[PDB]
Design a protein around this nucleic acid. Structure first.
Ligand code: CL
Ligand code: CL
Ligand code: CL
Ligand code: CL
Lengths: 309, 309
DNA sequence: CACAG
DNA sequence: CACAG
């Protein structure tokens, strides 16, 4: 996942109200722009800090690649000098209560500014350009200054999108793989959604939500332990590579906010706000031994899915 | 009539789309602002040049005095530092095709900038403040640069409003004047709209539109020659102080785009675009002698109403 | 160049 | 001060 800084002093209200970013494809004189070319590097799930009137107003999530689109008519005079041939990105804005003023924090972030194409000068004034790459270390510092609301956009939210993208591509690869038969293709695709032979096989091993004890099939998700995307075809359909979980527990486990020790002890991520466990009446403690086959997968989950600092 | 310059780079689209001007009543620190206090001097009919992104985008007509109003919610971050307690004016925007860039013309307008509270610096850069008085000589120069569309907002349009305001006040004075009887009050008020005993008396003198020859009562306006606002009570009800005119001819005569010599020769103002007379098939020439009584009033019209350079 | 200053 | 720069 990448971080971006979009400078929107001229058109923030129009871009926010329309849920987009927009730039020309080239400078007015027809020359290439590093900044406009950055539009073509943004991926769905990338986090975009909106900077306008000296403040960071939004921690946004990109929901498209750049697509060819005319300059928005609603820019009017404020956009007069930009070419009509442009790039648009669908940006899911998340307005923040703590609108940080980066110049007021320049001593804290200066060491983390990139040597080239920095969104800020060494004195903390913004540079006049549209879209800048933000190094991960600089992004961390900005998130520290904004507080919890910035972390809430990123962890188990923005950072899930690239995983979904990867899984979508694998689903395409399976559907076109000549080495596997039609039934296998169908069962592998269903297993991604906890359906088909995977669910029936899991039901021979597990009977309830580990955490909430619910037994009712219509209130349980068939979750993989080793994620579907990184499982091989045998592991994708293995009844021992799953748990039946209530939907909120599925959410916490799938995103690595929780995991389990081999003996069933729940492990809670530092990225899980404990006020979530209180609100949903989920206790820390022991949720029963796992089988040797389940433990092999749970080891993978602890080492690769579970969120650690 | 006064001219104003409103600098709207931060909020032009919101002010244009809402048909308003807005400022705080005081600076953020509670101190008086000359610029915000200018809001309380604007009169209906005053002309306001909108300046944004270095261009004059509108020649507007004020349609209210300033009224106490909260800062528009649609300003958002762009208006964050302004106090919520403000002044609003209803401004009738007229967008111009020729968006002049004053800095590109600074040699032409510099000699006409006021010594104090100028909207422009001597180098042609704008001053950072909201609302500036524009001297009449500076306004003329700006109108010369914009062209016909600016003149069209002012002459026989914006500059009629203060006349209507004056006439409204006189109507109030008449309605409250203890020296005249109820019938007189009614007849004086009706006469302003070409109704009542004035119309009946005019119909004993005139029978047709001087210019178009229409005789049909339902297609004729009873127009004063010496305007109702500056006529005394005898002159307001005098059948010899009027003409029956087709509505377009009433428009041209009432606003002083045309007048007449005592012998009936039509006089055409330099402020009348001749393409109006062509479009409406109105010929220059002679429209019949006026009576001695009518000539006394027509002298007043030529000397005071007729538009001369 | 140039969505900030 | 500060609706531009
Ligand atoms: Cl495209
Ligand atoms: Cl620098
Ligand atoms: Cl008021
Ligand atoms: Cl100066």
């Amino acid at each position: 996942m990448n971080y971006w800084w979009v400078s929107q002093k001229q058109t923030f209200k129009q871009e926010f109200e329309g849920g987009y970013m927009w730039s020309p494809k080239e400078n007015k004189n027809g020359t290439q722009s590093h900044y406009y070319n950055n539009m073509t590097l943004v991926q769905p799930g990338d986090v975009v800090f909106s900077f306008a009137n000296g403040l960071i107003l939004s921690v946004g999530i990109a929901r498209s690649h750049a697509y060819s689109y005319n300059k928005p008519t609603e820019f009017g005079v404020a956009g007069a000098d930009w070419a009509n041939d442009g790039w648009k990105i669908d940006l899911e804005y998340h307005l923040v209560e703590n609108k940080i003023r980066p110049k007021a924090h320049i001593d804290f972030i200066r060491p983390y500014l990139p040597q080239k194409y920095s969104p800020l000068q060494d004195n903390g004034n913004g540079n006049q350009a549209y879209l800048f790459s933000v190094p991960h270390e600089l992004a961390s510092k900005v998130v520290e200054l904004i507080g919890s609301e910035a972390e809430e956009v990123i962890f188990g939210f923005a950072d899930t999108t690239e995983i979904t993208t990867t899984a979508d591509a694998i689903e395409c690869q399976i559907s076109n793989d000549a080495s596997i038969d039609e039934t296998e293709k169908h069962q592998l695709v269903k297993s991604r959604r906890g359906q088909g032979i995977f669910r029936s096989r899991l039901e021979q091993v597990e009977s309830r939500c580990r955490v909430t004890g619910v037994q009712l099939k219509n209130h349980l998700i068939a979750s993989h332990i080793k994620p579907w995307a990184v499982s091989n075809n045998q592991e994708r359909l293995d009844g021992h590579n799953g748990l039946l979980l209530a939907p909120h527990v599925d959410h916490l486990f799938d995103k690595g906010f929780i995991s389990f020790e081999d003996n069933g002890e729940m492990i809670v991520s530092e990225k899980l706000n404990l006020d979530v466990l209180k609100a949903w009446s989920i206790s820390q403690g022991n949720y029963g031994y796992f089988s040797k086959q389940q433990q092999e997968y749970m080891c993978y989950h602890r080492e690769n899915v579970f969120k650690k600092l």
